[PDB]
Amino acid sequence: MVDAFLGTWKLVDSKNFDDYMKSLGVGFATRQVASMTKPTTIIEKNGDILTLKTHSTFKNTEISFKLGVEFDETTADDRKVKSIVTLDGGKLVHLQKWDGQETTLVRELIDGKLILTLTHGTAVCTRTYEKEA
Ligand SMILES: CCCCCCCCCCCCCCCCCCCC(=O)O
């Protein structure tokens, strides 16, 4: 099910991440650093538990979850959200809810690259990651 997503991924392109961050209320100085950061995302499974690590020179995060089971998450920008991750159409769909707001983080594989689409409000960001050997 999730197996083609597993591994270590490096950011190789980013479109509209500033728009997405601004929509979430991220401050200009943080957006400024984030716009020049290239994180590494590591996705691993142990049985039904997935762990997703995002590493950078600026901020690091880690979450563990079971598909289809809600979990508490504190995001990189310090939002305390209710999260759920599912597979939908072969895409890994992560929905975050807080204060009546929502954002989606949708991952899919196209030609071997991992495409992350981030939507909040009207902002739509597309980030492309390439697999590390
Ligand atoms: C956590 C590792 C850093 C990720 C690179 C961006 C650097 C920090 C930006 C922090 C403020 C904006 C955070 C809004 C959440 C987006 C999470 C997913 C982005 C991605 O994994 O590429």
Residue 9, amino acid: W
For this entry, resolution in Å reads 1.0
Question: From the alpha carbon of 127, which atom of ligand 1 is closest?
Answer: 22
* Whether the Cβ atoms of residue 80 and residue 72 lie closer than 8 Å to each other: yes
Method for this entry: X-ray
57 is in an annotated binding site: no
Beta-bridge partner residues of 20:
none
Residue for token pair 């943080």? 30
Ligand 1: residue of 54, 93, 119 to mutate (most ligand atoms within 8 A of CB) is 54
Residue 59 to residue 86: CA distance in whole angstroms:
25
Measuring CA to CA, which residue among 17, 25, 85, 14 is closest to residue 50? 85
129 is in an annotated binding site: yes
CATH of domain 7-128: 2.40.128.20
For the chain, give every domain's residue range: 7-128
Measuring CA to CA, which residue among 114, 108, 107, 110 is closest to residue 131? 114
Question: From the alpha carbon of 14, which atom of ligand 1 is closest?
Answer: 22
